[PDB]
Point group: C5
Chain length 334, copies 5
């Protein structure tokens, strides 16, 4: 049985985009029954179910299209590494889309499940919001192929779109690293340490996903049953290559960011050491001088030096000389 583990409740819509070599149709219903017929449609269809907290709908569709119910349980469990299972009817794919909110610097991950079946691609999102608008455009307009190709290319097209998003995400992150690696060693901030730890954390979650993502495309690139080897596989290679390019970049960032707090310590240590130097040069000229001026404010009666008309200047002289010898001796430090 079938519980949704996610946290996304409010949304529910269904997009259909049935398209053919000439002329492409598209609606948004909230009525699951209206979409089911496309199961049997002779040109490719992209049924996009947003809001799988509506588990009833996932059940109805899973049954009608003939998806083993363990798969439907996976689809609904969003805490899960990217993966690919092949079957007799259908390929089942689980992916993540990320979203990096600058400002408060945290990244959410929605989970997108794709099933390729017959001439359909089923898509299961958690909440409205996705990366796929490029693919909608290409269908609505035409811009190269996609119109001309079957549902396996549709799947290619979607998975490409999603992986291209990761590049945009990494750009945002590289940008944050550059900011951060400045804050640490020139212009620091209240929240620098926090952010540095945040960034580490995000990179972890990111890395944990990309390595598996590289597997799923490794699978879609070698053995490939109802994907037309004749055409589609070289495209799925293009995307596989991208995920390698991506996985490298993340290793780079993790590597780099691991040093930042160590830089930040070294900075603060400097900065503290400079504070202490100042305190010390001040303390170490004026404490003995105030001690001397403290002696000659003693109210003792056998105080011969107090008589001198030349004694007041001579202390000012010795107080000054002691101070000048000190400042010289601080041709080590400051």
């Amino acid at each position: 049985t079938l519980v949704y583990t996610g946290k996304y409740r409010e949304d529910f819509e269904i997009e259909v985009m049935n398209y053919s070599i000439e002329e492409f149709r598209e609606f948004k219903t909230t009525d699951v029954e209206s979409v089911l017929p496309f199961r049997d449609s002779s040109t490719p269809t992209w049924i996009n179910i947003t809001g799988i907290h509506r588990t009833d709908v996932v059940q109805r569709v899973g049954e009608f299209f003939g998806i083993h119910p363990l798969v439907l349980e996976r689809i609904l469990n969003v805490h899960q590494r990217p993966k690919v299972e092949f079957f007799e009817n259908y390929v089942f794919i689980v992916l993540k889309m990320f979203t990096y909110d600058k400002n408060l610097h945290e990244l959410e991950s929605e989970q997108v499940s794709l099933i390729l079946t017959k001439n359909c691609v089923l898509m299961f999102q958690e909440k409205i919001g996705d990366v796929f608008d490029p693919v909608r455009e290409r269908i609505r307009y035409n811009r190269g192929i996609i119109r001309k190709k079957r549902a396996d290319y549709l799947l290619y097209s979607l998975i490409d779109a999603l992986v291209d998003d990761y590049f945009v995400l990494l750009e945002k992150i590289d940008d944050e690293i550059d900011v951060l690696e400045e804050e640490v060693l020139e212009r620091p901030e209240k929240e620098t340490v926090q952010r540095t730890h945040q960034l580490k954390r995000n990179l972890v979650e990111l890395r944990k996903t990309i390595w598996p993502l590289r597997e799923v495309l490794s699978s879609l690139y070698r053995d490939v049953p109802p994907l037309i080897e004749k055409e589609t596989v070289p495209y799925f290679r293009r995307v596989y290559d991208h995920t390698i390019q991506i996985a490298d970049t993340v290793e780079t960032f993790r590597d780099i960011v691991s040093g930042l707090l160590d830089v930040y310590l070294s900075s603060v240590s400097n900065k503290t050491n400079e504070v202490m130097k100042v305190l010390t040069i001040i303390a170490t000229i004026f404490m003995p001088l105030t001690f001397i001026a403290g002696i000659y404010g003693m109210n003792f009666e056998y105080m011969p030096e107090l008589r001198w008309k030349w004694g007041y200047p001579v202390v000012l002289a010795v107080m000054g000389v002691i101070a000048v010898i000190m400042v010289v001796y601080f041709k080590k430090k400051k």
Copy 2:
């Protein structure tokens, strides 16, 4: 055959013989009453709680035909999760964990399972377990467990136990979120304590999960008296869970490894801010007190003491020097 554990006080035996049509249950402390079920034609769940009673483990081990090295393992609770297959029975060792809030430390009881014929033998240390879900489903004939044989019973138990780990990870994630906030506020020994505690717990946790993943890898691939027919896809579900779990723990370990480095960075800054204050104070008032110390030397012939635009003029120069200082603190604060 010695019991290495520390749990003495409990001893009971629960039987739950079930079929598609009826289920029996009882609790004896009389081992002889349970033995017959060895040959029962519908699945039985014999649950022996209190293995400090080694006599009972011996009697049962003999009757069911369990090689005595296995009975020695069953009794030794300091031990990594394991699976050994045999001709007649599968032997499995697992752990159940318990997160003590307060102490923030986690204890572990050891559960040994043997699947034999149409029986699942269960060997606990002490009363307390994670399996009540499975009891409910049998009692109230839920899901499909009544319809299925003893290998599904085993699936059902091992699933229940592995689901428990998710609950444990939730408690831990919750602590990490708390902690990773506490780390960058006021400096307190308690924070450091907890941080070290959390590291330690994640170690013990990791040391168990990796092996647990192996046992389910084994139950997913070779599979002799598990009906490949049906049961293996379920044991996959659980195997997948244990991967999901091991990934989470690697994530937490990774994350928590940084926390004391954050904490250092934070306290060090916080201290540096304290020193800044000491220094700005020390560095305006020490030279001012020095000036006021000069005038107040009890010297004879001190011309400035007499002049009466003099007391004001020092107050003036003392103030100006102080304002020059605060300006020069156009770097720090």
Copy 3:
């Protein structure tokens, strides 16, 4: 053939020839009296203590037909645990450890075992070993060691030795617990030292256990004049133990790696506490002593000095500026 060790004073030889009914034992210092047992049709346990007597190692090595490179290894005690198989004898090198609390250090004696035909040769450095359990089972005819051949004898010895490591790890876990308190609550003079010592010991320990795991991996997989019929499942029990042990040591190393980082974090706190005190003191009394320094200036025309409601008004202003400060220090403390 030189003995690289440091242990000179001891030499004796124990023999324990046993059969399904009658066991003999003696202690000679006369090597010739033991040699005959080479041909004994029931298993014999010849235990040569004091291999600094290299003459004795030579004589025995020759008589039993042990390639002389092996005899050179036996005598070289600075060496990782090893197993070499030969056509007719297995050669095994192991370590026994000894942890002294107080002065927190561990020594390691090296034990070499050769299994040949119906003999187990044992080569110790000095009197002292872990094997007394095995002697008592042979003397009082316990378990089933009397019933079994010389390959089980070997099992029995290697098991005994590996079980010792568990006892060692308990002592070490106990030191960790002590230490991880000294770091968090209530430190001591030598904590940093000991922390480094413990790391070092865990290195030496780890350096042996990983190889020990290999030797038992070898004795578990291919295994030629070990009766596969019986003995191999026991050698598995020991192999499993050595994994359990290697995990535990990885656990300790993991844990102990954190200690100095905890200790820094605690010192950092502790320092930050100190600086806070220095600063609140410095920052109330420096400006107050400055004011009291002004009115001890010996200037003429100091109107306030003879404004009599002046001494009180300063005491008032000195107190007020102090109370404002203490308020401002419900941030820090």
Copy 4:
């Protein structure tokens, strides 16, 4: 970006030219055109030719050439995408190779990377650079002045020659970096300033970027060393081994540096901490002799009446004596510290 098409991802606009160096044992000719058509014929030249296309932002030119020589268009898309790990793909006719050339800015201690793509086809080596600037002048000289044996050898040796040249460059880069490490690992023990920390972090970062390329570079030469189809095994493979060995030597060096540099900030912490501890020692010995002495001198400047000691007149000296003794006991007590 619909997947088929041909866009240049780099940042180098600005330059475009084409060098040809057709050589044989007896003559070589060379020219620089900006007219792609003039180069194409050399496809069928019976002696080896080195067509070097600088400025692949001109994607039109990459397309024209790719078509004429028969390069699957996915490869042409890779050639144009410069954010990419070194790699080797073999094909029926042509070997395709992607490499990086590095450039260490002193100043900004940072290192940029141009991407060089090489295709070996029949008796040609196609070279695709981003911008004018390369490491290959050694190979040009050897052709121009007929040195070593490159004139005698075919286009697969040309490829060897180029890849050797490029790999030798990395050694020069590592020298610059070793030199920086040696400097830095000294500077870490001197005064605390931020510039040190900066550089230390810069160096770590550079070694990361460096490591990211070398490990793949080692693979490409591993491939060129083992299976080798239109490389004459007779002759060329032992040379490609020489270069493979170099890249191992190189990768070891970088692992070495990363290993070493990982410690530097830890050294620097230990330095500054010491240095601070020495500052504090001075503050403390000063504060701890003069605070109690100023306190004594503060007592005897109290304006109290009935202050007997102020009178009885071996008194001023006796305080100076006790103030001095207290000070000398302090300095003695400070042969625990400094």
Copy 5:
């Protein structure tokens, strides 16, 4: 120069000698020429011989010998390039081996490495050193006094004998290093000095260089232990195992040292940090008793009027009393902080 040619990359540019030791079970022929031509004949000797060429900066000599014995010229280029990881290449006529000998100066805490190249051919072991100085005297003194069984055995055992000698040297090196660690791990505990940190970093660095060599050394002996073409499997391979085992034993020991030394700076921080915290404690207890006491004594040196307490005949004592009490309260409050 082109890559093909023969340059010596090392820094040892003064020594040149050649030793020959052509031995049989009864006659052994040793001389030292600087004349390369006199040694070349021995290639054909039916009993084993050990030609030892010291000073490969004389590249002419390496060339002449390499040609006469038939050593592919890429190998001769490797022999001359001393910046290079230990390795083994097998050929149809000869095994080629590259090794390092190390030398640890205490005082100056640094280690030099000379590179030794060995070629085993027919019945002759060629040895190529950089400079006079080596570890092989044991092997000479077994051939000269006909000890062990080296006289009885062929040139493959000669090679065994040399490689064993060299590997045994590493044990002596590790003892010197263990000795430094012991010194250092004492010097960390007690002291804040500048040279300690330096040395600690130095030792890390040395253990890196050492580790970078031993892991490859383990490989070369792994190769000489397994496939072994005309190394007489009958006899020699069990000896080459003995040495292979040694190199594992050695590699462990350095992993041990690296492990151990990785902690030292962390110990050193923790010490200094404590040490500083103890300094600050003293400053603070002094500051925090005497600052408020000097403040009180500062009040009663105010030149005000009226100041009633100045007259009161118990004023001066009562402050001395209150100043003492406030001090004693402080010292008690400092049983928290030692």
